Amino acid sequence: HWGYGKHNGPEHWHKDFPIAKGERQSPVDIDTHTAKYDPSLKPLSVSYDQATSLRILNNGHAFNVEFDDSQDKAVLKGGPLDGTYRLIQFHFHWGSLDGQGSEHTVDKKKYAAELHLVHWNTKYGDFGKAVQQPDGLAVLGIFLKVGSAKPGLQKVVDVLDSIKTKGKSADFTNFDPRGLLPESLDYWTYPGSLTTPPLLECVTWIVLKEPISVSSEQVLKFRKLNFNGEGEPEELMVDNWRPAQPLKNRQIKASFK
Ligand SMILES: [Hg+2]
Numbered sequence: 001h002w003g004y005g006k007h008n009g010p011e012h013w014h015k016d017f018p019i020a021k022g023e024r025q026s027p028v029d030i031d032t033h034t035a036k037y038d039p040s041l042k043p044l045s046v047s048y049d050q051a052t053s054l055r056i057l058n059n060g061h062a063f064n065v066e067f068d069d070s071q072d073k074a075v076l077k078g079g080p081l082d083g084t085y086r087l088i089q090f091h092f093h094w095g096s097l098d099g100q101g102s103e104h105t106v107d108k109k110k111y112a113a114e115l116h117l118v119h120w121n122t123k124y125g126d127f128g129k130a131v132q133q134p135d136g137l138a139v140l141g142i143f144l145k146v147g148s149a150k151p152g153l154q155k156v157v158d159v160l161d162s163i164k165t166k167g168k169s170a171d172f173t174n175f176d177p178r179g180l181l182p183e184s185l186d187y188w189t190y191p192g193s194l195t196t197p198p199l200l201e202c203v204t205w206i207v208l209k210e211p212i213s214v215s216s217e218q219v220l221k222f223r224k225l226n227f228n229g230e231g232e233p234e235e236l237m238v239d240n241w242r243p244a245q246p247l248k249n250r251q252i253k254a255s256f257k
């Protein structure tokens with residue numbers, strides 16, 4: 001069962017998920033001097049005002065904040081995207097130290113964490129169907145640096161106690177993901193994959209240039225979570241990130257000059 005340790009971590013995934021060595025795997029290093037401004041991108045539309053969060057869940061590898069996605073409540077459109085993509089869940093990847101934790105990197109710089117807001121292409125009807133398509137998914141990726149507290153993140157931080165171990169969930173309604181956005185919507189975009197098994201190559205990545213700042217205390221609370229389920233040897237949930245993968249035959253575009 002895949003994880004992030006020595007015996008079941010990213011170096012092992014290809015054995016059960018051969019696509020791990022595929023042609024459009026994620027994450028990737030974003031070489032800022034190789035990415036090219038793309039004037040054919042429309043502005044990005046992040047419409048999260050009617051968002052309907054339901055629950056937070058520790059899934060053994062991270063925590064998902066889940067959303068009701070049966071209607072166009074929280075949606076991503078515009079930018080490199082055709083049509084409407086519905087928010088289904090968000091989650092983070094983080095490190096054991098501030099010097100690591102992000103999945104994407106910018107000129108090889110690792111941020112302390114990365115937030116992924118996962119959306120699925122509404123013409124495919126549901127999420128399961130979206131993941132059979134090369135344009136099924138769009139992930140908004142937002143870097144986290146240690147700094148000032150992010151007030152919009154505190155609700156999440158405060159619930160972590162109650163979902164310490166694998167399989168625990170807690171009610172998590174009326175959470176507003178807008179509080180997790182940086183001021184600018186400048187981004188890089190490339191065709192990629194999910195960064196966890198089964199590593200399906202269904203993703204349009206939209207990675208914001210501007211990181212959000214979180215507090216040391218905020219990040220510290222992420223690191224108190226558990227990989228293991230209740231009553232098992234304690235393995236702190238830390239360093240749940242896949243390192244950068246071969247760019248291969250791919251182009252990263254900027255939305256900004
Ligand atoms: Hg897991």
Ligand SMILES: [Hg+2]
Nearest residue numbers: 133134201202
């Ligand atoms: Hg796909």
Ligand SMILES: [Zn+2]
Nearest residue numbers: 091093116195
């Ligand atoms: Zn992720």
